[PDB]
């Protein structure tokens, strides 16, 4: 049939999906005013995307650095951490990833759609978050390897550092699974860790 194949499709599909999910999470958790968001269609369902260049550039730079590590399946978890005014983690949206095309590639599209839908309504299964919140992103690699750090430093003005306990530690976290998908080429789950009392 065809010989033209990207080979790095899965990583790009994941990166693209992660961007949409991050935008949606920021919307439903009200980390930013609904004003900067514009309704859109992704995976054939409605999503909310930011139109703010500063924010968009931050999210894009972040995932671009991640991409290379995804291409080699060195990433165990990608986490969106919602922080309150005191800069303490209050919520964590965890994407636990495991990487074991054509129509089958659209198959994952259908599978990823379930995660988007779950995020859209997670507002219900979670407790309201504090006022002045912001966020950060954490990348848990499968193994502590210098190669991972090498690969991630792909943008001069956007460096990465090793996280600190104060960046990840959350008080009495409660688990809230949202979606688990299983299949060849991609096994992943999304769950939220929520501080017991906000």
């Amino acid at each position: 049939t065809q010989d033209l194949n990207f080979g790095q499709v899965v990583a790009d599909v994941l990166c693209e999906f992660l961007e949409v999910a991050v935008h949606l999470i920021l919307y439903v958790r009200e980390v930013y005013p609904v004003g900067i968001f514009q309704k859109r269609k992704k995976y054939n369902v409605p999503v909310q995307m930011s139109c703010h260049p500063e924010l968009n550039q931050y999210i894009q730079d972040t995932l671009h650095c991640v991409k290379p590590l995804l291409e080699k399946n060195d990433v165990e978890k990608v986490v969106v951490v919602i922080l309150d005014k005191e800069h303490r983690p209050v919520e964590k949206f965890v994407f636990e990833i495991t990487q074991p095309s054509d129509s089958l590639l659209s198959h994952v599209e259908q599978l990823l759609r379930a995660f988007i839908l779950k995020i859209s309504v997670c507002d219900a299964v979670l407790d309201h978050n504090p006022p002045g919140c912001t966020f950060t992103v954490l990348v848990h690699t499968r193994e502590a390897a210098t190669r991972n750090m090498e690969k991630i430093q792909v943008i001069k003005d956007f460096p990465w550092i090793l996280a600190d306990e104060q960046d990840v530690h959350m008080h009495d976290p409660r688990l809230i699974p949202l979606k688990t998908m299983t299949s060849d080429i991609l096994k992943m789950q999304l769950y939220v860790e929520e501080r017991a009392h906000k």
């Binding site: 703010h52 002045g132 992103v137 990840v168």
Partner: peptide
């Protein structure tokens, strides 16, 4: 050990900062 955990050095614009509509 948090030896396998990486994060961006830079912080994203705060919701407050965003309040300054520059589009």
């Amino acid at each position: 050990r948090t030896a396998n955990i990486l994060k961006p050095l830079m912080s994203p614009p705060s919701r407050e900062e965003i309040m300054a509509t520059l589009l």
